[PDB]
Every structure is written in C-alpha cells, then in structure tokens.
Amino acid sequence: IKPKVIEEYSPSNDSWKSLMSSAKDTPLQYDHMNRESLKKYFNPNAQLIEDPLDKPIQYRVCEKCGKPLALTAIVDHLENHC
C-alpha cells in the first residue's frame, strides 16, 4: 500500500461506547440527507423526518381523554393537560 496515504492519515480491542463523548457534542444527525448541502440549499430552521413512511405513525392514545400522542409528548400530557 502506497506510503503517502498511511503517512499523514494511516481482532480490534476498541469500543463503540467511546462514541458517547462525541455523541454528547454532536447536533442531531440524519443518515442520508447530507448536512452541508442542507445548509446550502435549505432553510436554517427546517424540520426534518428521515424516511417518514418507513413504518406507520408511532404514537399512543390516552385512556382518559383520548388524545393521540407523539412519543415525546405523552409525559407532560399526563402531568397537567389531561
């Protein structure tokens, strides 16, 4: 293998949980919508859902008031809105 690639770049014992640190510093990421192109061609405050029709909508319904709730919205709905 050519020496110049190795020169400045270059069973394993390393661990994937090492990524937590990076995960701690990293903004929300998408798998197949490149971030920089989104920056160039799209607005700075766009909402984004990757592969929205992959599976049916994930949610649950309150037994008491019958509201359909997004998974991230259920808890406070249960605290002071029902």
Binding site: S37, I57, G66
Partner: protein, 447 residues
C-alpha cells in the same frame, strides 16, 4: 397468533437486567442520532474479524465493542463462540436474535424504549392505536360544496411533520385561547383527535370538521363551503391563519417566521437581471415562496413545466441602463431556486385567458414522476436532490364548476383516494394516470 422471542423474555424476567438493557438501547439510539457518518462506518460497520465494511448487515454487540458481519457469519461466530445472541443492525437500530432467526419488532417496550422509565404509567394511562383508527382514515361528508376543503384536509391529514407537530401538543401546550370554534389549530387538533383516537367516551367523526367550518365561516364565509371555490386560495388562507395563531401563541423585528408552515414550506427564489452586452452584472432579487405555480400549456411532462417556469426571459418593455457598458438594453430575466422547502407544493395552472375576457380550463394530462429530482433548478455543482410524491389534488369539471379529489400515499406504498366521505384503495400506476392539479412532494434524499 404471532409469538414473541422467549430469550429476551427470560432476561426480562429480571427488572434490573431489563432496565440496564433499555438504558443502553436509549443511549445507543442517542448516539445514532448524534454520530457523524465516518465514525458510524468505521466503528459500527467494520467486522472485527475480516475488517470489511458492509459485508451484508453489520451487527453491533450489545455487551461489548465488537462488530460482526453477516455475509461471513462473523457476528454469528461471535454468538456461537462468545455466546452473544443479540446484535443491533447498524442500518436501522433493530435488534436481532440469532436463536429465533428473526428480528424483534413486536415488543412495544423495545420499539418505544425511550419511555421505558415511565412504561408502567405509559401502559396504564395509554393504549396502542386501535386497528380502525391507526392510519386516521375517514371521509369528510360534503356539507354543500366542501370538497375543495376536504380533499385538501385529507392531504393535511397525511403529513408526518404536521402529525408530529399536532401530536407533540405544541399548540395545545401554548394556546392562550384554547377553543376550537375560534382557533384553527385547536380545531385541527380536534380533527386529529377524532381520526386517530377517541372522544370521551350513522354519523361518526365529523366534530372537528364542523369546528373548522365554523372558524372559516367566522373569518370568511365565502370560503366556508356553501359555494364552489379554489383549493389553492383556501390553502394560502388557512396556512396564513395557522401562522397568525402561531404568532398569537408568542409571549412577546423577527422577519423569518418560526412557525411550522415557515419551517416546512418556505423557500426562496433567485431572480437575476443581466445585461445582454456585458453579460457580467447582475441585479439579483430574492423572493420568498410557500408554494410554486407552474405553467403547463404545450407540455406533457412535469419537468417540461418546471423548465418553462425556470426559463430565461428577455424583457422588451423594461427601461434599463447598464452600468458596465453605459447603455440602454433589453434585460435578461431568470428564475432559479435559492432555497428549497422541506415539503414542496405545486399548483398546475390549468387555465388560460381569451381575448373576449373569458377563461378556459386546461384538461391536459401532465405526466408526473413517483420520484422528483430538483437538482437542475438550484442556482449554485449541485448535488442530487430528490423528493418523494405523497399527494395529489385533482379537479374534474370546468373553471367555474367541478369536483376535487385527493390522493395520498401511506407506509408500505399503497395509495388511497379521498373523495369526500369515500376513502378507497388505489394502485400507484393509476394515481400516476390521474389528471394532477396540485402535487405534494416530500424531501427524501439530499446528496
């Protein structure tokens, strides 16, 4: 009567092991949402044995740092030799049991693991969607001439961003008025409530629609459904009312709106004005848009219509003095895309004006693709930019009289036709044979 994997059940017989597992799954998914592409490739798609990338699915070990491939059975080998029967597929985060020879997709706790800490409460306070309501499919009866409203509402009924917004309770959480007979968004939330859930505790599921109609009557009776009207005008009117309610929800010079409409539908056009002599210049004007209106005459394909839309024009009626060559010229005008929206809405201009002051409908079939590439319209090389078709509104009749229908695509790839009260199954190819008036495209891939 589909069964569930007993191997994970055994682990789940112990509460602390279960909690450890769910905590780790949640942490892992957070990492997956917060990891750049290269780290993921190098650390989750690299086989610990052969060091190949993407040797079929690569599995991330639940108990250690090892990654193992499928094609050479290297995770499989990790499972036989080290005893780890569970691995996570790095393409989708889904958990495989090598004993069942199947993924575990049917454990609600696992699918919704972020709420695991509160799961008991979640299971006591809330239920999974009912089979009947799970896709929110229901017709909206004609209450006079309200089809131009309901077809549109059906497309609104199928937008994942909108459903995430509504189900997130944002308006509900922040509304200072909290009445659906005044607030359009409250009314919408009521509709969502009726279609996906259950009001406490044949005429079914029309209450929200009636509220919306009441609000509409109160602001502009002409667009409230008694008389025939234009679906696009209703679209702009209602999204503007939604925006006004968002602004209303503020506790307090902020030109870009931060609302759901303006974070989804707003783009910007670039208009260039150039001297035909100097060909240097140019006088550039940037215009926001919430939708695009396309000419369709003498054309057969959507790309042709966008090309016409995007086509350069020489003004012959513009007073112009060039600063580089110091002379009067007939300027060149061009439209291109400066910024794209997350959801792209297209109106086909299916009409023309005659010298006698009358108008005529254009019934011309315009071919539209299942997947749309917008790369040719971006002004500044541009990477591939592809949208997925999710919606169509069609009109049958003439300019002054007709009928609107909606077509929406849901998970799995099936199309449905929404004709007032009637929701029916339709194939993609037939949808593609429809006379499109409005088209709704959602962003799918950005290169």
């Amino acid at each position: 009567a589909m069964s569930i994997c007993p191997h994970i059940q055994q682990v789940f017989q112990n509460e602390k092991s279960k909690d450890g597992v769910l905590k780790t799954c949640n942490a892992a998914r957070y990492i997956l949402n917060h990891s750049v592409p290269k780290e993921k490739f190098l650390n989750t798609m690299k086989c610990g044995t052969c060091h190949e990338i993407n040797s079929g699915a690569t599995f991330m070990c639940l108990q250690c740092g090892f990654c193992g491939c499928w094609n050479h059975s290297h995770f499989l080998s990790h499972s036989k030799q080290i005893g780890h029967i569970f691995g996570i597929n790095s393409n989708n985060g889904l958990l495989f049991c090598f004993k069942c020879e199947d993924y575990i997709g049917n454990i609600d706790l696992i699918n919704d693991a972020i709420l695991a800490k509160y799961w008991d409460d979640v299971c006591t306070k809330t239920m999974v969607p009912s089979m009947e309501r799970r896709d929110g499919l229901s017709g909206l009866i004609n209450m006079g001439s309200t089809a131009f409203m309901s077809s549109i509402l059906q497309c609104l009924i199928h937008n994942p961003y909108f459903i995430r917004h509504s189900m997130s309770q944002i308006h509900s959480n922040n509304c200072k008025v909290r009445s659906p007979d005044k607030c359009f968004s409250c009314a919408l939330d009521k509709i969502v409530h009726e279609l996906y859930g259950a009001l406490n505790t044949s005429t079914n599921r029309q209450t929200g629609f009636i509220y919306l109609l009441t609000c509409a009557w109160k602001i502009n009776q002409n667009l409230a459904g008694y008389s025939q009207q234009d679906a696009h005008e209703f679209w702009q009117f209602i999204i503007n009312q939604i925006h006004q309610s968002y602004v209303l929800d503020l506790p307090n010079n902020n030109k870009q709106c931060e609302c759901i409409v303006h974070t989804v539908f707003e783009g910007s056009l670039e208009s260039s004005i150039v001297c035909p002599g100097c060909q240097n210049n140019s006088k550039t004007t940037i215009d926001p848009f919430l939708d695009l209106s396309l000419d369709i005459k003498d054309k057969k394909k959507l790309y042709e219509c966008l090309d016409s839309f995007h086509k350069k024009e020489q003004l012959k009626d513009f007073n112009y003095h060039c600063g580089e060559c110091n002379s009067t010229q007939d300027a060149i005008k061009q439209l291109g895309i400066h910024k794209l929206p997350s959801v792209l809405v297209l109106q086909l201009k299916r009409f023309e004006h005659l010298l006698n002051g009358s108008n005529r409908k254009l019934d011309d079939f315009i071919e539209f693709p299942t997947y749309l590439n917008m790369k040719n319209y971006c002004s500044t090389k541009v990477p591939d930019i592809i949208y997925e078709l999710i919606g169509i509104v069609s009109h049958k009749g003439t300019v002054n009289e007709g009928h609107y229908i909606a077509f929406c695509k849901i998970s799995g790839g099936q199309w449905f036709k929404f004709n007032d009260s009637m929701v029916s199954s339709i194939s993609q190819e037939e949808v593609l044979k429809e006379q499109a008036y409005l088209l709704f495209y959602t962003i799918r891939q950005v290169n």
